Structures are given as C-alpha cells and as structure tokens.
Ligand binder design. Sequence first.
Ligand code: CLA
Ligand code: CLA
Ligand code: CLA
Ligand SMILES: CC1=C[C@H](O)CC(C)(C)[C@H]1/C=C/C(C)=C/C=C/C(C)=C/C=C/C=C(C)/C=C/C=C(C)/C=C/C1=C(C)C[C@H](O)CC1(C)C
Ligand SMILES: CC1=C[C@H](O)CC(C)(C)[C@H]1/C=C/C(C)=C/C=C/C(C)=C/C=C/C=C(C)/C=C/C=C(C)/C=C/C1=C(C)C[C@H](O)CC1(C)C
Ligand SMILES: CC1=C[C@H](O)CC(C)(C)[C@H]1/C=C/C(C)=C/C=C/C(C)=C/C=C/C=C(C)/C=C/C=C(C)/C=C/C1=C(C)C[C@H](O)CC1(C)C
Lengths: 226, 220, 40, 226
Amino acid sequence: RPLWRPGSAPPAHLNGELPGDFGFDPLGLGANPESLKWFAESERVHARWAMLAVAGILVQEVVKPDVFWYDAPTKIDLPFNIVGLLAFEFFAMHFVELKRWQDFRNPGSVDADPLFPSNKLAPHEVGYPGFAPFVPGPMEELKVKEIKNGRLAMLAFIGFTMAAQVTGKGPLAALSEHLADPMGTTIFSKAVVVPGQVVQPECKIPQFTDFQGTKIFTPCLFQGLW
Amino acid sequence: AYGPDRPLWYPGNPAPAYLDGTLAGDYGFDPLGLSSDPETMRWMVHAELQNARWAMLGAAGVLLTSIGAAVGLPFPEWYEAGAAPLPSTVHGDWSFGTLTATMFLLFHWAEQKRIMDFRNPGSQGDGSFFGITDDFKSKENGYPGGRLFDPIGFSRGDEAMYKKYKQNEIVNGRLAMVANLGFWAQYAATGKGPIQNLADHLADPYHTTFTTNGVSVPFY
Amino acid sequence: MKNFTTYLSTAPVVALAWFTVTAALLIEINRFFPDPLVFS
Amino acid sequence: DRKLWAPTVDSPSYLNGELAGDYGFDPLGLGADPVALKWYRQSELVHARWAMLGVAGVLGQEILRPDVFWYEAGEPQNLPGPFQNINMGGLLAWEFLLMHWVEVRRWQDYKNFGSVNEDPIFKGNKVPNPEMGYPGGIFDPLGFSKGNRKELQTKEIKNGRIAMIAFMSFVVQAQATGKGPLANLADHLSNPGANNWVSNINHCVTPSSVDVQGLTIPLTCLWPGS
Ligand code: CLA
Ligand code: CLA
Ligand code: CLA
Ligand SMILES: CC1=C[C@H](O)CC(C)(C)[C@H]1/C=C/C(C)=C/C=C/C(C)=C/C=C/C=C(C)/C=C/C=C(C)/C=C/C1=C(C)C[C@H](O)CC1(C)C
Ligand SMILES: CC1=C[C@H](O)CC(C)(C)[C@H]1/C=C/C(C)=C/C=C/C(C)=C/C=C/C=C(C)/C=C/C=C(C)/C=C/C1=C(C)C[C@H](O)CC1(C)C
Ligand SMILES: CC1=C[C@H](O)CC(C)(C)[C@H]1/C=C/C(C)=C/C=C/C(C)=C/C=C/C=C(C)/C=C/C=C(C)/C=C/C1=C(C)C[C@H](O)CC1(C)C
C-alpha cells in the first residue's frame, strides 16, 4: 500500500479497505471505527463539493474574467431575489441531504423513488448512490482517482481563498503574477516573521462587503496569524 | 508518567504511596500530603482537570487577542477587554448585571450535572435530559467521554493514544496555569500585557529582565 | 489529611471558625448598611 | 588497543572501538544510551561534513574573491552575478523545500534504516546505504568506499573534527578582528605580540544588526563584547 511517507507505519485502524487509504492518521482521529465511517462520508462529500467548486471558480474566470469569485455574489445580477433563491436552495438541499444521510444512518432504506415506488436504486455501498451510467475503468481505480482528485481539489480551494485574501485576484490572475516574478511573489517574498519583526500580507478583503444595501461581514481568515 | 518508574519531581526522593503513577501527569509531587486521603485525591484530580482546562482556554484568549493587538488588529488587551462595550443582540442590548446573572445561571446547571455524576456516577445518564444517557456518563473522573464530549472518539479509539493524550492535557494545563500567573504578574509589574512583554524582551534581552521593572526587585 | 481534618473538626477549631464567619458577617453588614437602629 | 584521548584514562565500555575515531572521549557519558549514540553519531557526521564544506568555502572565497568579508557575504547585494539583490524570501523558498526533502529522507533512514533507499519517482535506482550515515552509490560516484571505507571513515571523522573546531575559530577571530581566516594569519605574522587575542578580544567588531531587504536581522558576538 502506498503510504503518505515511505518508511512510515500505517496506524492499526487503517488496515485499508476505504478507497485511497495511505495509512495517514498522525493524530489518530478515525481511531473509533464508527467515527472513521463518518469521517469517510465527510471526506467524499467535501471532495465532491470542492471538485465542483474549484472547477467553477476557474471556469467563471475563463468566461467572465471580470467578476471576482470571492465577491461574485455582490458583482452578479441574480435572476431571482436572494431570499427566494436561498429559500428554494434550502428546501432543495435539505431534501437531498436528508435522504443522503438516512442511507448512511440505515443503509438501503431510502434506495427507492418515494413518489414512484416502481423506480428503485439497485443495492449500493454508502457514499456511492448508484448513479453510474458510465464508469471508465475499474470501479476501485476510479474511486481512488475520485478521492485523490478530490483531496487535491479541497487543498486547491483553501489555496484559492487564501490567495484571494493575500492578493486581490483569482487563481489564474495570481498564477500569472507568480509566473511573471517567480522569486518575488512567493508567500516568503511577501510575508516574513523574524524573532523580533512581524511582516504579514495585507488583507485585500474589506472587513464588511455591502450586498444590495446589506453590508456582509467578510473577515480575512485569522488575519492576525499570518 | 503512567509508569512505576515514571520520572519524579525531585530525583532521589521516593514518590508518595497514594501517587502510584496511573493518574495523568503523576510525578509523585505532594510535599504537604494534601492528597493523603484517597477521596481527596479523586476531588483534587477533578479540580486540577477543571482549573487547568479553563486556564488553557483563558491562556489561548490572552495570547490570541494580544497577538491581534500587536499586529494592529483592533483587539483590547486582556486587562482592558472588560471595560470594552458589550455587543448588541437580535433580542436586545446586553446589561452587565444580566450578563453576570446569565453566566452564573448557565454554569450552575452544568456544574450541578457534572458534580452530581462525580458524586453519583451515571446519575446524569438516566434519559432524564432528553434521553441522553451514555453521553452523560463519565469514562473517568475528569474524563466525561461520550458522543457529546469526545465527538471524534480519541477515548473510544486507541487507549495508548487516549493515555498519551491524557498526559498532553495534564502537562499543557499545568503550563497554562503557570503561564496565566505570568500574564497577571507581568501585568502587575510592567503594565503592558504579554506579546508586548515578549517583544520588549526580544529587543533588549539583557536590560529588559524582571530585575529591571521597578516592582519585582524593590531595591534594584 | 484524614487526621489533619479530624483536628480541624475539634470543638476549639470549629468554634473559632463558626464565630469568625458570624462576626465578619455582622461587621460586613454594618459596613454596607451602617447605623441599623430600626427595621424601617 | 586503540590510543585513547589521555594517557591515564580508561575507555567507557559503550565505546568499544567500532565507530571511527573512537578515542574513548565521553567525559559527560552522553553516548551511554545506544539510541543516543546512534543519533549523536549521525549528528557528528552531518556537522563534520557541513563544516569541512564550510571551512573550504571561507578559505576559498577569501583566496579568490577577497573584497567580500566571509561574515558579510549573505547580504543580497553581496550575492554575486544576478543573485545581487535577489528576493531573499524567494531564495529561502528554494533552500527550504529542497533541504526539507533531503533532510526528511535522511531522517527516515534513521527511523527505519535501509528503508528510504529506492528512488521514489523513478524505480530500481537504489543506494547501497551499507551503514547509516554512509549511503554510497550515487553519493559515492568515483567509488573510494569500495576499499577500506573504515580507514577512510577514520580520516573523514578526524578531518571533520578538526574542521568543526576550525570553522568556529574563523567565526570568533572574524567577529573580533573583523578580518577573514588568512588575513588574521597575515596580521599575526606581521607583528606577533601586537596582533594577538589579547589586543583583539576586547572588541566585538561586526554590526549589532543587519536589515536584509526590509527584514532587520539582529547579530551577536559569541563572547560578550568588552
Ligand atoms: C475534507 C475533510 C477530510 C476528512 C473528513 C478526512 C477523513 C479521513 N481521511 Mg483525509 N485528507 C483530507 C481531508 C479529509 N480527510 C485532505 C484535504 C487531504 C490532502 C492532504 C487528505 C489526505 C488523506 C490521506 C493521505 C489519508 C487520509 C485518510 C483519512 C481517513 C483516516 C484519517 C482520519 O481519520 O482523519 C480524519 C480527518 C478529519 C477528522 C478531518 C480533519 C479536520 C480538522 C479538524 C482540520 C484541521 C486542519 C486541516 C489539516 C485543514 C488544513 C487547512 C490548511 C492548513 C491547508 C479519514 C476517514 C487516510 C485514509 O485514507 O484512510 C482510509 C489517509 O491515508 N486523508
Ligand atoms: C495544490 C495546492 C497548492 C498549489 C499547487 C499552490 C500553488 C501556489 N501558491 Mg498556494 N496555498 C495553498 C495551496 C496551494 N498553492 C493552500 C492550501 C494555502 C493556504 C495555507 C496556500 C496559500 C498561499 C499563499 C498565501 C500564497 C500562495 C502562493 C502560491 C503560488 C506560488 C508562490 C508561493 O508562495 O507558493 C507557496 C505555497 C503555499 C503557501 C502552500 C502550498 C502547499 C500545498 C498545499 C502543498 C501541495 C503539495 C503537493 C505535492 C502539490 C504540489 C503542487 C502541484 C503538483 C499540484 C503557487 C502557484 C503565493 C501566491 O499567491 O503567488 C502570487 C502566495 O502568496 N499560496
Ligand atoms: C555536534 C558535533 C559532535 C557530535 C554530535 C559528536 C558526537 C559524538 N562524539 Mg565527538 N567530537 C567533536 C564533535 C561532535 N561529536 C569535535 C569537534 C571533536 C574534536 C575535539 C570531537 C572529538 C571526539 C572524540 C575524541 C570522541 C568523540 C566521541 C563522540 C561520540 C560519543 C558519545 C557522546 O558523548 O555524544 C555527545 C556529543 C555531543 C552531543 C556533541 C554536542 C556537544 C555538546 C552538547 C557541547 C559541546 C560544546 C563544545 C565544547 C563547543 C566547542 C566550541 C569550540 C569548537 C570553539 C558521539 C556520538 C567519542 C567516540 O568517538 O565514540 C565513538 C570519542 O572518542 N568526539
Ligand atoms: C501540587 C502541590 C502538592 C503539595 O502538597 C502543595 C503544593 C506544592 C502547594 C501543590 C502545588 C499547587 C500549585 C502549584 C497550584 C497552582 C495553581 C495555578 C497557577 C492555577 C492557575 C489558574 C489560572 C487560571 C484558571 C486562568 C484563568 C483565566 C481565565 C478563565 C480567562 C481570562 C481572560 C481572557 C481569556 C482574556 C480576557 O480579555 C480577559 C479574561 C476574561 C480575564
Ligand atoms: C474534548 C475534545 C473531543 C473531540 O473528540 C476532539 C476535540 C474537539 C479536539 C477535543 C477538544 C480538545 C481541546 C478543547 C483542546 C484544547 C487545547 C488548548 C486551547 C490548550 C491551550 C494551551 C495554552 C497554553 C499551554 C498557554 C501557553 C502560554 C505560555 C506558556 C506563556 C508564555 C509567556 C508569558 C508567561 C507572558 C510573556 O509576556 C509572553 C510569553 C513568554 C509568551
Ligand atoms: C564528544 C563529546 C563527549 C562528551 O560526553 C561531552 C562533550 C565533551 C561536550 C562532547 C564534545 C562535543 C564537541 C566538541 C562538539 C563540537 C561541535 C562543533 C565545533 C561543530 C562545528 C560545526 C560548524 C559547522 C557545521 C560550519 C558550518 C558552516 C557553513 C555550513 C558555511 C559557512 C559559510 C562559507 C562556506 C562561506 C560563505 O561565504 C559564508 C557561509 C555560508 C557563512
């Protein structure tokens, strides 16, 4: 089994069955088996949401390079009122999340169309609803690609947000700024903490961003610890 | 710790009988036999697992707000973060008298349940509070494990990690308690609050000691 | 400590404590509410 | 029997003579625990190999480029070629990750000897690493360990121990006189009695602090300056 650090010893709890296991639990978080099962659902859900997000942020910068992803909501004209969009979004997400969770709670209970009992999802593993019209390659191989791709995406998002707080531009603009002066755009080249001095990158995010007349508090993640 | 040959406080001096070495951070240190009684030990262990935990949170705050005020971020220093105006609430404005009363009221409820389980183990786990039972049980004195107090499951997981984690907590808590006396004593001598005292000591390390502060050494 | 607490329970020690608390209470009461001649 | 550090001493048992340069010199009994001896040895070898490189650079740099004071050569402007006034933060970035990989890999050879020996990216390419601290292979290209490596190891440790002592001389005799290693030899040979440690130890000749590209770096002399 490939390990996060060659020569390391994987923790007992990680015998390896979950796709993308690399014996990485330095603090032993998923020591409890049920806890590991939950964390496993969290990892997949986080990765899939992040994978869609990272892609969207990049696309919404190739198509509309003007609107900044961080302040996109305040820079875009919603076809519907936020209250109405948020209301629908809440009920929509609430429904899918409830059925999604019920499966994790009691496996194989929500695996059927409630409106049309004729429709019923085939038996499936938790975390994998069953929507697999096309699977290009071994399921486990694609599972590892999904978790590896997802883990990379989740890290990329934090990078998108932090870069958007240190600089005031999106991922593509920031990367170009790096490609222009590679040895003078790194975080080290913009922030240094010496035993006596404290140079921290300026927060390019207004503490509060007004939205449709409602100033929305937008804090720079731990601006005090940079 | 967690050993019969655990490192002790005064290498050479034998450890107290009551201090076997099981208790977290046990170094056989009870010179005035304060915990000679076994029941006293249990109470003292719980009390330490109470002062240290609060002290740890308090130290995290005096350090985070201080770090902020030094970087520039509007943060009142620990000493003046009480006269700071209380924030408003959707319900209404906050009043100091109500704030104190609410703080004690809530604390009385939690303290009662904690002490009641301490006196009567599992007493709180009677589904009396909305059916919560095992989550209201106590894995050990000062260790109220469950799915509400240890959500991630360090206690439910590897005991070695749990035991190691228990030592980390005791040692860190004792340090935080000592650190807190510092934050207070350095204030009541320098009048500046930490992170300013760390910054002064790192700018003139030799001429910025406790000896040169007026209050510490009176003659000097 | 079991035998130290036993000593701190002996009549002379307990009386010294009880009285000190009672005395201090009356002193503190007059300290904040002085000249209590009548119950008004 | 091996010759020991003093004509009257008796070697500590743990120092049986296996390690190179075993002159039974452990007055503080630091290497008594076999784990610590193992670690300390790796630290000795790393410190020696780094000081032998260092004592060559100080001497060499002076011989060739004599304008730059060894003590003041890490300044961006002092840096030669284009390196002059190069963002030190960006430079640190390179010196950081690159050093972190080589060091961590070496550390994992301590934690699990002969475990990190194969090229992680490519494959098959492996290093003999016969002894911890002596990888050989690509690390020994011209192949001189193939002979009596132990004898060569003895020369290496003895030369390194002399260097370690010499580089800390270069450091002191430079922060006192203000001149390099061979310049201090020249001054002595000019007027011996008048250019000694007596007429030079009463002054810490070297800046109290150095601002590097906006980052002030405090400096100090090993002996409290008179
Ligand atoms: C989205 C959150 C998330 C969650 C819930 C998990 C959960 C899990 N991971 Mg995982 N991981 C994540 C993100 C996450 N991971 C990311 C982003 C990476 C890329 C670095 C990895 C890389 C990784 C590897 C290589 C391995 C795991 C493994 C595991 C499983 C066992 C380890 C464990 O129990 O830790 C539980 C994890 C959590 C409880 C979440 C931690 C949340 C804390 C509170 C946040 C702390 C800060 C955090 C590091 C964010 C940093 C932000 C910034 C500094 C970049 C477990 C079910 C092991 C495995 O596959 O076994 C099956 C394993 O080998 N993960
Ligand atoms: C896949 C993750 C990833 C990648 C590829 C990058 C890439 C880059 N980052 Mg970045 N970053 C990341 C995550 C990542 N970051 C995260 C999670 C954070 C929050 C802690 C940050 C916070 C951050 C700041 C504040 C800044 C950058 C900056 C930069 C650019 C170079 C300058 C620099 O200082 O880099 C430094 C890199 C870091 C500070 C963190 C990267 C560490 C990642 C997570 C490890 C990934 C290792 C793995 C082998 C992947 C390798 C990369 C690639 C093969 C995918 C560069 C293109 C600078 C910039 O914006 O340029 C103008 C800069 O200001 N990043
Ligand atoms: C950091 C450098 C370093 C390190 C890690 C070691 C480590 C070791 N040496 Mg060693 N040695 C060194 C430098 C070093 N040496 C130098 C420069 C010399 C030349 C004088 C020697 C000469 C020497 C001899 C003759 C012998 C050893 C031996 C040993 C081993 C005995 C176990 C021990 O006591 O470890 C502990 C040692 C350390 C932890 C080194 C740290 C130094 C301590 C903490 C303080 C020293 C400060 C020092 C006086 C400052 C000098 C300044 C000056 C140059 C201006 C051990 C593994 C014995 C051996 O070979 O066994 C196989 C032995 O016979 N060494
Ligand atoms: C064991 C033994 C035995 C023998 O026999 C005898 C003897 C010796 C006596 C003993 C010993 C003992 C000891 C040492 C003790 C100590 C303790 C401590 C220090 C504590 C702390 C303690 C400390 C603590 C708690 C702390 C606390 C704090 C808190 C909560 C908080 C605070 C704050 C903050 C956040 C900030 C803001 O702005 C303000 C405030 C609000 C103010
Ligand atoms: C239960 C649970 C369960 C689940 O499952 C999971 C989880 C959630 C994870 C868990 C939790 C946990 C926790 C809570 C923890 C905490 C911690 C802390 C905060 C600590 C502190 C800690 C803190 C501390 C130590 C403190 C420290 C401090 C100090 C020393 C001081 C220092 C100093 C002083 C004197 C003053 C000056 O001027 C400055 C200086 C020099 C700087
Ligand atoms: C054995 C024993 C045993 C018993 O038990 C105890 C006792 C006796 C204590 C012990 C002893 C010990 C010792 C002696 C130690 C020593 C150490 C040292 C001296 C090191 C050095 C060390 C040193 C070193 C590393 C060096 C380093 C250096 C380097 C990297 C570099 C430099 C430089 C050069 C090139 C040039 C440029 O332009 C600049 C720079 C960059 C600045």
